[PDB]
Amino acid sequence: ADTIVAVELDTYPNTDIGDPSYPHIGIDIKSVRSKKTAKWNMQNGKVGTAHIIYNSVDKRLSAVVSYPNADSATVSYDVDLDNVLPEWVRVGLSASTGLYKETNTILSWSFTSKLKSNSTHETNALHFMFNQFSKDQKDLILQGDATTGTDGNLELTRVSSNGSPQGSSVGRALFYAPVHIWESSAVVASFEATFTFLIKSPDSHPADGIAFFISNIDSSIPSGSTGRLLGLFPDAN
Amino acid sequence: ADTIVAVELDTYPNTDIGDPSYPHIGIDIKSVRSKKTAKWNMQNGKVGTAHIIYNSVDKRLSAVVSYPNADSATVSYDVDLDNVLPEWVRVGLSASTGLYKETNTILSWSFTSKLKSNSTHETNALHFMFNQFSKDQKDLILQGDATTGTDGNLELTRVSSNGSPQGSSVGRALFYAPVHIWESSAVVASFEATFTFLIKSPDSHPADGIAFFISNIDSSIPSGSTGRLLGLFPDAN
Amino acid sequence: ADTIVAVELDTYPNTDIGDPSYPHIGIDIKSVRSKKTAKWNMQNGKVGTAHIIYNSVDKRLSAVVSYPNADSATVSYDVDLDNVLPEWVRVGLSASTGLYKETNTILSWSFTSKLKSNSTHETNALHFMFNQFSKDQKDLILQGDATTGTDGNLELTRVSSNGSPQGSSVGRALFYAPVHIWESSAVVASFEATFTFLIKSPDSHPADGIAFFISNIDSSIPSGSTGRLLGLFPDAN
Amino acid sequence: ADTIVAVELDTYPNTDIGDPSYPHIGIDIKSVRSKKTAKWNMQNGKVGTAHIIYNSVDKRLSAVVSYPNADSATVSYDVDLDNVLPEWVRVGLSASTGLYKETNTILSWSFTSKLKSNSTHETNALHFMFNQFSKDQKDLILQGDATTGTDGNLELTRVSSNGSPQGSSVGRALFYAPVHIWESSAVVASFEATFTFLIKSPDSHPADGIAFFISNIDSSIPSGSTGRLLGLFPDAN
Amino acid sequence: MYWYPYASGS
Amino acid sequence: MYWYPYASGS
Amino acid sequence: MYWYPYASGS
Amino acid sequence: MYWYPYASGS
Ligand SMILES: [Ca+2]
Ligand SMILES: [Ca+2]
Ligand SMILES: [Ca+2]
Ligand SMILES: [Ca+2]
Ligand SMILES: [Mn+2]
Ligand SMILES: [Mn+2]
Ligand SMILES: [Mn+2]
Ligand SMILES: [Mn+2]
């Protein structure tokens, strides 16, 4: 299987598998059953911002999600990513819909990774920033129903001719180049991701969510991972 | 007086005022009596590196100090800087000697500060990097015995023409422009400072240390703050 | 006097001193009489973007000014800034009005300066980015009628209680810290500035303009430099 | 075949194909016959630095190559990359030897690319920095005799176990992810690459050189492109 | 326009 | 709304 | 490495 | 500086 670490912006509560009874954001370590969550005051129709950070000194993964002029949701979890992920991974965005739907639109996405090794000022770094996506984005790997170019945005899931979200859809976007997320002879390893999104549901009932994830380089959409599984896990265990 | 927050690299053990009985790195909050310390295998004559990081999400100040191909010393402390520092501060490096001396040479220093206000991706940021200091460094405020120019380094405390450190010396270097460190509605606030130092001592045990500090804008060296006081505090309370 | 180098976004043509007969952008070297200009299709009421760049390898100062979905104005000029400016300077924004007026609003401003010296990877750098201005912006020097905080923007010239621009007004904003723009033992020195603006004239007749400038550290608004002089020069010579 | 654009550090004078009679740096556009060159005081055994810059405003490609406390060699050329390269390219380093040899060691390499689209401050950017290469550098595509791992450097051409360069060798290293180099409506497009190299030779005159290049994504080493062809061109046309 | 399910906003 | 002097736009 | 108290890596 | 052709800074 795959090794997944993710920060989910869950819009639909599936209390039958662990979801609290309301929209939430949570940290997933190899399982869709979040290790820690936080109620999130999801606001349909508004552009929001997600900020994820992590450093090997504290070994704490944190996320913040907020809307302009509103409170923010915050969730953290102590985890040594060395014992969870391989040293070379790929990063991306995932989203899905099922019985209920929403538009999982990404307006921008940036990421920064820094590695300082067993030497004086020996830092390796990777940084990419997307503020608009082209029809042909050769530096992104689009999986499932994911598409780019629609008004310079990244639509992670199916959307009709002009904006109507579709049910039973899954899509992902991974950055083309592999990322060196950690090393043994590393003094400080840190990364931070940021993305603005616009989740919209014509009918006032959305699902299923958006997630920022890290995985093995060859990761691909698990079989039947639409809906509650956010295109990340093969089952609800 | 002054409001200080500092990460000290204490080379001499002053058990008479709280210092653990061995060289260490610590986090001081308005007092030379560290809120938390960690053993530090200081290495006379070797160039080292210090890395200080902080983010408003975790509200945890951490520091890493290490030498090439050697182990690292780490120290963290949960602290909400909103309730300790004014929103506008000045950042700098301080050092000193007393009966015993050491050279307090800074070979490079960089700082980054980011303030993400509660608005659709509205970030304010400041970043400076010094890889070599000149005789007339106009973007720096030198206090006490601090000087710049030799070999393109910043010598925080007095050094003879031949290169021997002098006893009873205090020196500080502050970046000229004020730094907006926090704000009432900042979704995320964070900063990270880095600097390489070279501490050499001819006599037996070296003293007294180097410290990275954040203070009120008009701060200056307290009287008699040489030696154990690292040029940061007026007394040992 | 002062040493001024500027890139002007002239909105009013004063053909009596050299202005071409239409809005233009130009490069000024110690004189308000541009060394080179370019017609600029000024668009009242729209937020625009100015981009200035310079590198010591080509010794060419270039500027681009455009509005979303529109053509851009471009102007360049070969100049060795070493023979024109002192090595330590200050950077800022200037604007004015006279008989005719406009709002000289700045929505954001960033600047980056890099200096690589006579050594292996010895780079000094300064970078600041403003996306919103606070009422009390301690890292900016406000001269003349310049003010900050009004909706998170920087109003370079007088504006009534809710938006009406005033005539005969001059204001400037310089970054607090001095900048090391060039050195003798420098392999490559480069800087780039960017700012978004919103020039608006209630009546359909604007004047006088906005300018990005570099000057000696102690520069201040020349006597009677309102109107056509953009708060930069003491006379029209 | 391949569309190439390169800045070469030519160590051996092949007057039989255009090379000025002395070591030089040059700018090649789809041909090993430099459109423009400049004398270069190559220094056997010394670590040097190369700096390549380009911006869509001036449409001028420039390069600086220098050694600590020595003079620099500069070379520029006006060229509109829009009409030479496809919009998506791959960047890399190439080197080779022939009858005569030299070590073509890369100690560090960084690249930055920014694409400012015609929209209210909408920038896409890519940035990577390698200060030390590992045995398994997954974000790099090694071709020919290129290898990474020893001392944490990138050895472009063959080197014996003891450290002696080998004749008739070709090697290239390309960054894994495609790079969006230009666009139909980009207000400003620019990039800058930097790398430190160490060229040592045991025999008389060294050969054949190192080159920074931009090519189509699926590019690869042409057959027989060792020696004078720098592993970039199939023939000397 | 186009509003939401249940948490507040404009 | 609030338009301009002479060069085109929306 | 001129010299140093409680020291030496390997 | 093991050695080098047409060379030497100062
Ligand atoms: Ca769910
Ligand atoms: Ca002490
Ligand atoms: Ca005018
Ligand atoms: Ca040749
Ligand atoms: Mn969940
Ligand atoms: Mn202490
Ligand atoms: Mn003019
Ligand atoms: Mn050549």
mmCIF file of C-alpha atoms in Angstrom, chain D residues 22-231:
data_model
loop_
_atom_site.group_PDB
_atom_site.id
_atom_site.type_symbol
_atom_site.label_atom_id
_atom_site.label_comp_id
_atom_site.label_asym_id
_atom_site.label_seq_id
_atom_site.Cartn_x
_atom_site.Cartn_y
_atom_site.Cartn_z
ATOM 1 C CA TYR D 22 42.139 31.133 -25.366
ATOM 2 C CA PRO D 23 39.919 29.834 -22.534
ATOM 3 C CA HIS D 24 36.600 31.611 -22.627
ATOM 4 C CA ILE D 25 32.959 31.806 -21.599
ATOM 5 C CA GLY D 26 30.288 32.048 -24.253
ATOM 6 C CA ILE D 27 26.626 32.092 -25.096
ATOM 7 C CA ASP D 28 25.416 29.398 -27.476
ATOM 8 C CA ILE D 29 22.081 29.459 -29.237
ATOM 9 C CA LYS D 30 21.367 26.123 -30.877
ATOM 10 C CA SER D 31 25.023 25.855 -31.899
ATOM 11 C CA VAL D 32 28.425 25.164 -30.341
ATOM 12 C CA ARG D 33 29.577 28.232 -32.333
ATOM 13 C CA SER D 34 29.053 30.900 -29.656
ATOM 14 C CA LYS D 35 27.055 33.954 -30.680
ATOM 15 C CA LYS D 36 29.353 35.888 -28.341
ATOM 16 C CA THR D 37 32.384 35.099 -26.160
ATOM 17 C CA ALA D 38 34.716 36.728 -23.622
ATOM 18 C CA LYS D 39 38.247 35.953 -22.449
ATOM 19 C CA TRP D 40 38.314 33.888 -19.256
ATOM 20 C CA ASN D 41 41.325 33.506 -16.950
ATOM 21 C CA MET D 42 40.476 29.980 -15.903
ATOM 22 C CA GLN D 43 42.368 28.908 -12.780
ATOM 23 C CA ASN D 44 43.312 25.243 -12.489
ATOM 24 C CA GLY D 45 42.478 23.923 -9.029
ATOM 25 C CA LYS D 46 40.587 26.952 -7.733
ATOM 26 C CA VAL D 47 36.877 26.881 -6.848
ATOM 27 C CA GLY D 48 34.979 29.340 -9.043
ATOM 28 C CA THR D 49 31.473 30.743 -9.356
ATOM 29 C CA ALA D 50 29.142 31.203 -12.316
ATOM 30 C CA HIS D 51 26.121 33.508 -12.345
ATOM 31 C CA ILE D 52 23.617 33.460 -15.260
ATOM 32 C CA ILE D 53 20.705 35.961 -15.430
ATOM 33 C CA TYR D 54 17.893 36.800 -17.829
ATOM 34 C CA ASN D 55 14.709 38.906 -17.803
ATOM 35 C CA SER D 56 11.934 39.347 -20.374
ATOM 36 C CA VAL D 57 12.021 43.126 -20.021
ATOM 37 C CA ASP D 58 15.514 43.595 -21.484
ATOM 38 C CA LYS D 59 15.518 40.265 -23.303
ATOM 39 C CA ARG D 60 19.250 40.039 -22.570
ATOM 40 C CA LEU D 61 21.021 36.881 -21.379
ATOM 41 C CA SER D 62 24.132 37.609 -19.253
ATOM 42 C CA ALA D 63 26.768 35.585 -17.431
ATOM 43 C CA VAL D 64 29.475 36.327 -14.871
ATOM 44 C CA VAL D 65 32.234 33.873 -13.966
ATOM 45 C CA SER D 66 34.798 34.689 -11.319
ATOM 46 C CA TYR D 67 37.310 33.484 -8.775
ATOM 47 C CA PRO D 68 37.803 34.933 -5.258
ATOM 48 C CA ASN D 69 40.005 38.062 -5.219
ATOM 49 C CA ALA D 70 40.420 37.928 -8.990
ATOM 50 C CA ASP D 71 38.829 39.642 -11.947
ATOM 51 C CA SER D 72 35.549 38.610 -13.509
ATOM 52 C CA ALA D 73 34.680 37.619 -17.046
ATOM 53 C CA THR D 74 31.357 38.889 -18.365
ATOM 54 C CA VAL D 75 29.335 38.160 -21.460
ATOM 55 C CA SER D 76 25.884 39.331 -22.564
ATOM 56 C CA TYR D 77 23.732 38.826 -25.622
ATOM 57 C CA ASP D 78 20.425 40.254 -26.701
ATOM 58 C CA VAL D 79 18.109 37.361 -27.391
ATOM 59 C CA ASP D 80 14.345 36.848 -27.254
ATOM 60 C CA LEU D 81 13.945 33.397 -25.725
ATOM 61 C CA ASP D 82 10.257 33.394 -26.698
ATOM 62 C CA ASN D 83 11.332 32.687 -30.263
ATOM 63 C CA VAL D 84 13.969 30.092 -29.447
ATOM 64 C CA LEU D 85 12.693 27.832 -26.714
ATOM 65 C CA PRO D 86 9.403 26.021 -26.223
ATOM 66 C CA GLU D 87 7.483 27.343 -23.226
ATOM 67 C CA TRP D 88 8.228 24.255 -21.134
ATOM 68 C CA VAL D 89 11.893 23.324 -20.778
ATOM 69 C CA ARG D 90 14.316 21.478 -18.516
ATOM 70 C CA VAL D 91 17.453 23.037 -17.026
ATOM 71 C CA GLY D 92 20.785 21.392 -16.321
ATOM 72 C CA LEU D 93 24.561 21.224 -16.220
ATOM 73 C CA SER D 94 26.725 19.502 -18.819
ATOM 74 C CA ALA D 95 30.471 18.805 -19.114
ATOM 75 C CA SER D 96 33.011 16.689 -20.966
ATOM 76 C CA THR D 97 36.592 15.760 -21.759
ATOM 77 C CA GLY D 98 38.320 14.450 -24.902
ATOM 78 C CA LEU D 99 42.013 13.791 -25.534
ATOM 79 C CA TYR D 100 42.774 16.177 -22.677
ATOM 80 C CA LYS D 101 40.830 16.002 -19.418
ATOM 81 C CA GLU D 102 39.882 17.909 -16.288
ATOM 82 C CA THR D 103 37.588 17.289 -13.353
ATOM 83 C CA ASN D 104 34.173 18.897 -13.768
ATOM 84 C CA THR D 105 33.004 19.107 -10.160
ATOM 85 C CA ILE D 106 29.895 21.026 -9.109
ATOM 86 C CA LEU D 107 29.894 21.982 -5.433
ATOM 87 C CA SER D 108 26.529 23.744 -5.416
ATOM 88 C CA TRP D 109 23.801 24.777 -7.817
ATOM 89 C CA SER D 110 20.709 26.914 -7.454
ATOM 90 C CA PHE D 111 18.036 28.181 -9.816
ATOM 91 C CA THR D 112 15.115 30.595 -9.581
ATOM 92 C CA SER D 113 12.380 31.215 -12.097
ATOM 93 C CA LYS D 114 9.526 33.738 -11.870
ATOM 94 C CA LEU D 115 6.619 34.223 -14.239
ATOM 95 C CA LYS D 116 4.460 37.295 -13.606
ATOM 96 C CA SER D 117 1.224 36.806 -15.541
ATOM 97 C CA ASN D 118 -0.947 39.692 -16.705
ATOM 98 C CA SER D 119 -3.145 39.792 -13.586
ATOM 99 C CA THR D 120 -3.081 41.811 -10.335
ATOM 100 C CA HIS D 121 0.219 40.464 -8.961
ATOM 101 C CA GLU D 122 -0.103 36.830 -10.069
ATOM 102 C CA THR D 123 3.337 35.236 -9.930
ATOM 103 C CA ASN D 124 4.313 31.618 -10.511
ATOM 104 C CA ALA D 125 7.773 30.679 -9.252
ATOM 105 C CA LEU D 126 10.183 27.792 -8.954
ATOM 106 C CA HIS D 127 13.339 27.685 -6.843
ATOM 107 C CA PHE D 128 15.755 24.945 -5.900
ATOM 108 C CA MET D 129 19.116 25.081 -4.158
ATOM 109 C CA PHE D 130 21.598 22.218 -3.884
ATOM 110 C CA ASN D 131 24.437 22.774 -1.445
ATOM 111 C CA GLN D 132 25.285 19.125 -1.207
ATOM 112 C CA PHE D 133 24.353 16.195 -3.426
ATOM 113 C CA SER D 134 23.636 12.715 -2.035
ATOM 114 C CA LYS D 135 24.288 9.264 -3.536
ATOM 115 C CA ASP D 136 20.615 9.000 -4.467
ATOM 116 C CA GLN D 137 19.498 12.438 -5.648
ATOM 117 C CA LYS D 138 15.950 11.654 -6.827
ATOM 118 C CA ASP D 139 15.152 15.214 -7.952
ATOM 119 C CA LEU D 140 17.956 15.066 -10.516
ATOM 120 C CA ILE D 141 18.223 13.210 -13.813
ATOM 121 C CA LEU D 142 21.774 12.023 -14.329
ATOM 122 C CA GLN D 143 22.829 11.237 -17.907
ATOM 123 C CA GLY D 144 26.074 9.859 -19.310
ATOM 124 C CA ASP D 145 28.941 9.611 -16.813
ATOM 125 C CA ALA D 146 27.388 11.980 -14.235
ATOM 126 C CA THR D 147 27.343 10.794 -10.612
ATOM 127 C CA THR D 148 26.605 12.244 -7.165
ATOM 128 C CA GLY D 149 27.744 11.274 -3.689
ATOM 129 C CA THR D 150 31.496 11.804 -3.237
ATOM 130 C CA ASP D 151 32.155 14.579 -0.703
ATOM 131 C CA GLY D 152 28.571 15.549 -1.418
ATOM 132 C CA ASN D 153 29.410 16.924 -4.846
ATOM 133 C CA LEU D 154 28.121 16.345 -8.363
ATOM 134 C CA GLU D 155 30.863 14.926 -10.605
ATOM 135 C CA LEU D 156 29.708 15.567 -14.169
ATOM 136 C CA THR D 157 32.413 13.475 -15.884
ATOM 137 C CA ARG D 158 34.311 10.272 -14.963
ATOM 138 C CA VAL D 159 36.853 10.395 -12.154
ATOM 139 C CA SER D 160 39.102 7.549 -10.994
ATOM 140 C CA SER D 161 38.959 6.167 -7.462
ATOM 141 C CA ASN D 162 42.033 8.238 -6.566
ATOM 142 C CA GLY D 163 40.579 11.400 -8.090
ATOM 143 C CA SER D 164 42.080 11.579 -11.586
ATOM 144 C CA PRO D 165 39.817 12.778 -14.401
ATOM 145 C CA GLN D 166 39.319 10.435 -17.361
ATOM 146 C CA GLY D 167 39.424 11.284 -21.057
ATOM 147 C CA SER D 168 36.485 10.857 -23.448
ATOM 148 C CA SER D 169 33.724 11.458 -20.925
ATOM 149 C CA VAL D 170 30.293 13.108 -21.079
ATOM 150 C CA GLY D 171 27.892 13.856 -18.272
ATOM 151 C CA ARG D 172 24.763 15.882 -17.631
ATOM 152 C CA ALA D 173 22.490 16.596 -14.704
ATOM 153 C CA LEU D 174 18.977 17.963 -15.265
ATOM 154 C CA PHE D 175 16.477 19.085 -12.635
ATOM 155 C CA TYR D 176 13.609 16.555 -12.620
ATOM 156 C CA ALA D 177 10.640 18.930 -12.892
ATOM 157 C CA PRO D 178 9.836 20.787 -16.143
ATOM 158 C CA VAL D 179 10.237 24.553 -16.019
ATOM 159 C CA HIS D 180 7.705 26.977 -17.474
ATOM 160 C CA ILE D 181 10.216 29.381 -19.003
ATOM 161 C CA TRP D 182 7.938 31.780 -20.885
ATOM 162 C CA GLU D 183 4.334 32.563 -21.717
ATOM 163 C CA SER D 184 2.383 34.439 -24.385
ATOM 164 C CA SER D 185 1.168 37.156 -21.983
ATOM 165 C CA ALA D 186 3.752 37.220 -19.171
ATOM 166 C CA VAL D 187 4.308 40.832 -18.104
ATOM 167 C CA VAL D 188 7.714 39.815 -16.764
ATOM 168 C CA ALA D 189 9.617 36.514 -17.008
ATOM 169 C CA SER D 190 13.054 35.968 -15.516
ATOM 170 C CA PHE D 191 15.444 33.410 -14.135
ATOM 171 C CA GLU D 192 18.871 33.261 -12.545
ATOM 172 C CA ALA D 193 21.106 30.238 -12.060
ATOM 173 C CA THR D 194 24.230 30.000 -9.921
ATOM 174 C CA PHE D 195 26.795 27.279 -9.357
ATOM 175 C CA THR D 196 30.308 26.819 -7.981
ATOM 176 C CA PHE D 197 32.648 24.524 -9.880
ATOM 177 C CA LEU D 198 36.106 23.094 -9.335
ATOM 178 C CA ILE D 199 38.102 22.308 -12.484
ATOM 179 C CA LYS D 200 41.416 20.511 -11.936
ATOM 180 C CA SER D 201 43.718 19.015 -14.549
ATOM 181 C CA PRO D 202 46.865 16.860 -14.161
ATOM 182 C CA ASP D 203 48.029 16.999 -17.784
ATOM 183 C CA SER D 204 49.088 20.101 -19.686
ATOM 184 C CA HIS D 205 46.067 21.999 -20.958
ATOM 185 C CA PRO D 206 42.639 21.000 -19.568
ATOM 186 C CA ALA D 207 39.480 20.290 -21.596
ATOM 187 C CA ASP D 208 36.784 20.557 -22.543
ATOM 188 C CA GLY D 209 34.475 22.544 -20.285
ATOM 189 C CA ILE D 210 31.259 22.946 -18.322
ATOM 190 C CA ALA D 211 27.992 24.436 -19.500
ATOM 191 C CA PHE D 212 24.704 25.559 -18.060
ATOM 192 C CA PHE D 213 21.896 24.699 -20.467
ATOM 193 C CA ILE D 214 18.184 24.990 -21.164
ATOM 194 C CA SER D 215 16.581 22.412 -23.457
ATOM 195 C CA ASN D 216 13.394 20.662 -24.494
ATOM 196 C CA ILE D 217 12.098 18.363 -21.759
ATOM 197 C CA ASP D 218 13.048 15.016 -23.337
ATOM 198 C CA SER D 219 16.593 16.081 -24.277
ATOM 199 C CA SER D 220 19.511 13.684 -23.972
ATOM 200 C CA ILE D 221 23.225 13.446 -24.783
ATOM 201 C CA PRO D 222 23.824 13.364 -28.552
ATOM 202 C CA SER D 223 26.056 10.559 -29.819
ATOM 203 C CA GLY D 224 29.749 11.432 -29.991
ATOM 204 C CA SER D 225 29.228 14.764 -28.254
ATOM 205 C CA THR D 226 32.299 14.247 -26.066
ATOM 206 C CA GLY D 227 35.228 16.639 -26.240
ATOM 207 C CA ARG D 228 34.722 19.923 -28.112
ATOM 208 C CA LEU D 229 30.969 19.371 -28.265
ATOM 209 C CA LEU D 230 30.426 19.670 -24.490
ATOM 210 C CA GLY D 231 27.750 16.960 -24.569
#
